[PDB]
């Protein structure tokens, strides 16, 4: 399993700059073991409960919109995304619901 494959082994769509990944597209990578990266965190002494999504490559905003379209029970203002690390934060505990949606495709 070489880290540098042969020049012939690679094909066009595996080269950065093709297949317009960075536009209107998002990919979420599973953890080392193979579980979805959705975790719950208790903050400020356990009083505040949040849900986080990590390992997001692409456009976080549209992934946020797509999830919002699938879980309309979570209010509009509960979602918040940090741009420094590309993490989507939900003001409640919705690890179960988000995992159900995410696994549908990823």
């Amino acid at each position: 399993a070489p880290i540098f494959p042969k020049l012939e082994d690679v094909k066009m769509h595996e080269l950065i700059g093709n297949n317009n990944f960075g536009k209107k597209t998002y990919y979420v990578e599973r953890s080392r073991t193979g579980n979805l990266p959705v975790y719950s965190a208790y903050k400020n002494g356990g009083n505040k409960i949040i849900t986080e999504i990590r390992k997001i490559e692409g456009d976080v905003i549209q992934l946020r919109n797509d999830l919002q379209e699938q879980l309309p029970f979570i209010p509009k203002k509960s979602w918040s995304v940090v741009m420094q690390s590309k993490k989507i934060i939900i003001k409640g505990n919705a690890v179960e619901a988000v995992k159900r949606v995410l696994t549908k495709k990823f």
Partner: protein
């Protein structure tokens, strides 16, 4: 209905040219994973590495003499009562002219800092990625990968200059002249260079000895994130680049799924 309509697969390769040292003539394309040369610029991780390296590199020789290490006798300079002046003890008190320094540090002061291994590996890749994105990373390979363009006879295939030890000519030798014209042709004379090499290349250090102030040669298992970011033009052997990639690859388990 489509659950996640805007979801797709990411690319997993970027193209890096392979050339010869004296003249940066391309020889072949060697695909390289996106994690090691094309990664998003996250300055925070670089900031963690740069300060971490900066802390571990300190000497900490500060050593002011405290009131205990200051050489004065422990005798009351003046009687407590009746003298009409302020109360004073021994002549080492910080408030006096010749007294020691309060809260004095003692060498060797400790400034060591520690970082998780995974964070350091990520920072290192982000450094190569920034150099490659800015088109400042040159790879000198061959002799181990398929060649689709013959190597020039005069040029070598590694970061080393031959005939640099036959200095039984004049005050100069061939190695310097080759280096000087290499510097001039590519317009990188006064600019900072970093040469990462597989093994100790005595020829390159000898030729670059005149330019200590701007040219530095480092081995595989010595390069730091500071030196890669500092250098405006990084030259790295393909063998070294592979070694760095393995040493700083995101370990992955089976992760078998349907």
């Amino acid at each position: 209905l489509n659950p996640l309509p805007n979801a797709a697969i990411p690319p997993k390769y970027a193209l890096v040219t392979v050339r010869s040292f004296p003249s940066l003539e391309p020889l072949t394309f060697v695909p390289v994973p996106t994690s090691t040369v094309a990664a998003p610029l996250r300055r925070d991780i670089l900031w963690r590495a740069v300060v971490y390296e900066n802390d571990n590199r300190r000497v900490g020789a500060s050593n002011p003499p405290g009131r205990s290490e200051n050489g004065f006798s422990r005798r009351k300079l003046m009687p407590q009562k009746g003298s009409g002046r302020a109360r004073v003890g021994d002549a080492n008190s910080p408030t006096r002219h010749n007294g020691g320094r309060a809260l004095a540090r003692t060498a060797p002061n400790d400034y060591t800092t520690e970082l998780p291994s995974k964070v350091y590996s990520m920072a290192f890749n982000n450094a190569l990625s920034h150099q490659y994105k800015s088109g400042k990373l040159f790879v000198i390979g061959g002799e181990k990968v398929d060649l689709i363009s013959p190597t020039p006879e005069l040029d070598l295939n590694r970061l080393d200059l031959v005939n640099t030890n036959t200095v039984e000519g004049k005050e100069i030798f061939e190695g310097e002249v080759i280096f000087r014209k290499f510097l001039e042709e590519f317009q990188l004379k006064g600019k900072r260079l970093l040469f990462i090499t597989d093994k100790t290349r005595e020829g390159l250090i000898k030729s670059s000895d005149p330019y200590k102030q701007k040219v530095d040669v480092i081995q595989k298992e010595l390069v730091e994130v500071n030196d890669i970011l500092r250098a405006q033009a990084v030259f790295i052997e393909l063998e070294a680049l592979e070694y760095l990639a393995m040493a700083h690859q995101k370990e992955i388990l089976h992760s078998v799924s349907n």
